């Protein structure tokens, strides 16, 4: 029922999800001037060598690559985090044009897309319990700009036709998510929310400073997807991003000087 349409869009979500107007909503604009370096931030640790992708699916607002999270096969640690966070899925938000698509912005600068690697705190036993907690989730956010191709993206791009419409999934094994990372893991962090309903405020955001480059051909394959189910009138899956939300009380910290 909720979506990115003129009618069911971000501006109207509060109607069914009144936390949309809460104090810790994501995304936010990252003002480099006010976001200060914190030398007590530790570096990111990502152990992804045993990462086990299972499937890719079109859920009608994006596509999710899903991972076996029954063990610490693919985990995020350090940075601002206490304890171990298991990767459950990743997905993207993107725009209709290159000049937009990101959810977070940097001094109002919008990127072409934003990749989210979603992890959940093993303190709580499973994802379902984790989302009910303020320290429940860590999402690694990675900006996309258009330019050079991303080799490690191509495995994903190359299946997208097989899941064009809402409802469709396909097997997707032996995908390595290290292949979606940039060279520097310098980051900004701040407490926030899910950017889609139910918009729970359960996320330590970790937004990487260095964008990854992707090819024109790569982003266009994204834009070929459909929100609609098979048979319906075609609405292309584009502009599946939420605009910057009020920062309110919160401080954004930088891992770098």
Active site residues: 61
Minimal distance, residue 195 CB to Zn ion, in Å? 5
DSSP string, 199-223: --S-EEEEEESSPEEE-HHHHHHHH
Closer to Zn ion by Cβ: residue 104 or 221: 104
7 annotated to bind ligand: no
Stretch that binds Zn ion, among 29-37, 70-78, 110-118, 206-214 (CB under 5 A): 110-118
12 annotated to bind ligand: no
Q: Kindly determine how many residues on this chain lie close enough to bind Zn ion according to the rule CB under 5 A.
A: 1
196 annotated to bind ligand: yes
Residue in this structure with the two tokens 């370096």, named with its chain if needed: 37
Closer to Zn ion by Cβ: residue 217 or 225: 225
d(CA 114, CA 96): 13
Residue 229: phi, psi to the nearest 5? -80, 170
192-212 CB burial, b ≥16 within 10 A, e <16: bbbbbbebbbbbbbbbbbebb
Closer to Zn ion by Cβ: residue 116 or 166: 116
d(CA 84, CA 13): 32
Q: Which residues contact residue 100 at a Cβ distance below 8 angstroms, ignoring those fewer than 6 apart?
A: 110, 112, 239, 241
Stretch that binds Zn ion, among 15-23, 63-71, 113-121, 126-134 (CB under 5 A): 113-121
d(CA 111, CA 211): 9
Which x/- pattern, by CB under 5 A, does the window 138-177 give for Zn ion? ----------------------------------------
Closer to Zn ion by Cβ: residue 37 or 61: 61
Minimal distance, residue 190 CB to Zn ion, in Å? 15
Closer to Zn ion by Cβ: residue 38 or 145: 145
Minimal distance, residue 239 CB to Zn ion, in Å? 14
Strand, helix or coil at 11? helix
Asked if 24 touches Zn ion (CB under 5 A), the answer is: no
Which of 6, 5, 41, 13 is closest to 245 using CA atoms?
Answer: 13
State how far the alpha carbon of 196 is from the alpha carbons of 2, 17, 68, 149, in Å: 9, 10, 23, 28
Q: Which of 116, 150, 168, 242 forms a contact with Zn ion (CB under 5 A)?
A: 116
Can you say which residues are annotated as belonging to the binding site for Zn(2+)?
A: 91, 93, 116
Can you say which residues are annotated as belonging to the binding site?
A: 91, 93, 116, 195-196
Kindly list the residues in this chain that would bind Zn ion in the complex (CB under 5 A).
Answer: 116
């Amino acid at each position: 029922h909720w979506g990115y349409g003129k009618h069911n869009g971000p501006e109207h979500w509060h109607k069914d999800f009144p936390i949309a107007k809460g104090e810790r909503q994501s995304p936010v604009d990252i003002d480099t001037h006010t976001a200060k370096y914190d030398p007590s931030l530790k570096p990111l640790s990502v152990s992804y060598d045993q990462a086990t992708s299972l499937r890719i699916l079109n859920n009608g607002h994006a596509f999710n690559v899903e991972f076996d999270d029954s063990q610490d096969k693919a985990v995020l640690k350090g940075g601002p985090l206490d304890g171990t966070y298991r990767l459950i899925q990743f997905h993207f938000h993107w725009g209709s044009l290159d000049g937009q698509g990101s959810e977070h912005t940097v001094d109002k600068k919008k990127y072409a897309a934003e990749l989210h690697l979603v992890h959940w705190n093993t303190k709580y036993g499973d994802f379902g319990k984790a989302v009910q907690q303020p320290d429940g989730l860590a999402v690694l956010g990675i900006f996309l700009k258009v330019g050079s191709a991303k080799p490690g993206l191509q495995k994903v791009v190359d299946v997208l036709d097989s899941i064009k419409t809402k409802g469709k999934s396909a097997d997707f094994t032996n995908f390595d998510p290290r292949g979606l990372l940039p060279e520097s893991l310098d980051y900004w962090t701040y407490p926030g929310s899910l950017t889609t309903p139910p918009l729970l405020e359960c996320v330590t955001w970790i937004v990487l400073k260095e964008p990854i480059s992707v090819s024109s051909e790569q982003v266009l394959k994204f834009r070929k997807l459909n929100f609609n189910g098979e048979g319906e009138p075609e609405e292309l899956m584009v502009d599946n991003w939420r605009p910057a939300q009020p920062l309110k009380n919160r401080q954004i910290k930088a891992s770098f000087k």
